[PDB]
Amino acid sequence: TLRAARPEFLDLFPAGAEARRLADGFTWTEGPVYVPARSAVIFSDVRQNRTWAWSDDGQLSPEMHPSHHQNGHCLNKQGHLIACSHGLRRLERQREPGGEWESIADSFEGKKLNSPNDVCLAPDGSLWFSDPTYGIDKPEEGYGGEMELPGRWVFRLAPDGTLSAPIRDRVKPNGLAFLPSGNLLVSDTGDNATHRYCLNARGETEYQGVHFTVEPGKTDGLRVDAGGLIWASAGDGVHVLTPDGDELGRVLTPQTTSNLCFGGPEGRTLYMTVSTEFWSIETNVRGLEH
Numbered sequence: 619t620l621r622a623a624r625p626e627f628l629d630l631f632p633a634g635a636e637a638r639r640l641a642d643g644f645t646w647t648e649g650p651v652y653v654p655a656r657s658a659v660i661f662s663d664v665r666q667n668r669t670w671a672w673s674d675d676g677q678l679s680p681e682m683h684p685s686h687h688q689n690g691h692c693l694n695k696q697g698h699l700i701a702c703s704h705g706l707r708r709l710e711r712q713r714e715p716g717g718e719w720e721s722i723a724d725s726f727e728g729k730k731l732n733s734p735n736d737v738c739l740a741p742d743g744s745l746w747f748s749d750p751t752y753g754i755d756k757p758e759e760g761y762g763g764e765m766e767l768p769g770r771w772v773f774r775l776a777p778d779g780t781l782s783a784p785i786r787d788r789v790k791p792n793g794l795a796f797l798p799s800g801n802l803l804v805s806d807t808g809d810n811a812t813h814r815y816c817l818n819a820r821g822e823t824e825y826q827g828v829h830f831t832v833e834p835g836k837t838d839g840l841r842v843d844a845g846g847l848i849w850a851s852a853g854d855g856v857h858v859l860t861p862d863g864d865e866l867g868r869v870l871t872p873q874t875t876s877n878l879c880f881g882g883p884e885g886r887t888l889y890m891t892v893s894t895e896f897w898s899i900e901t902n903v904r905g906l907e908h
């Protein structure tokens with residue numbers, strides 16, 4: 619259900635729009651992305667080592683088992699499915715349904731990655747991913763392992779194959795979302811705040827400061843819509859913020875929401891990974907595209 623902090627919040631949803639559960643029986647849902655070619659949202663259950671598909675015709679189907687504790691997902695420029703893998707400690711790509719998984723980033727300067735958590739596509743085609751240590755710290759969320767890197771970074775995987783780590787000042791970087799300006803937002807689940815960086819072109823960043831915090835809980839995954847509004851996970855649902863970080867309202871969920879994505883047959887459905895369940899609400903807006 620909807621709780622407006624400002625009137626214009628209601629403009630964002632069709633009349634009588636309500637958050638509703640789509641599916642249950644999961645342990646910890648995460649990492650949803652809509653794949654138009656498959657007419658389905660793919661999402662992970664991180665704590666059950668599997669991924670699922672929710673089709674536009676309203677069917678839940680198993681996607682991958684084991685998934686090697688895949689977590690976050692996005693599409694690359696070509697619309698290939700991109701996964702963050704806790705278990706394999708890598709970023710990986712799937713070209714086609716049922717197709718083999720290809721590693722696209724599995725080490726940095728002779729060191730293993732920690733455990734990629736979330737990923738997003740940059741306007742220049744680069745794939746940016748957060749590398750906190752949840753995937754190797756929590757045995758329920760991966761295959762174990764020890765940290766090899768100096769810290770928990772945000773990586774940029776250039777379309778040509780060049781891997782860099784331009785963001786090294788975060789505690790546990792987690793959710794990532796680009797803004798219409800082409801600058802980047804980074805949620806930090808150690809800092810418990812969402813942070814803003816300017817991208818000085820081509821994989822070089824400058825920290826701008828804390829963009830916002832949320833209560834109750836904290837922002838894990840987040841997305842930005844076509845108008846630049848920020849759709850941010852929290853303890854009680856999704857908080858919708860102005861581009862400057864001011865709260866318009868919230869979509870309330872009975873448990874914590876970890877992540878979210880725009881999709882559906884019109885691109886206007888907001889899917890939410892809500893702990894043990896998977897939820898959606900109809901909106902009047904689409905995800906940002908570039």
Ligand SMILES: [Mg+2]
Pocket residue numbers: 690735736792793838839876877
């Ligand atoms: Mg996450």
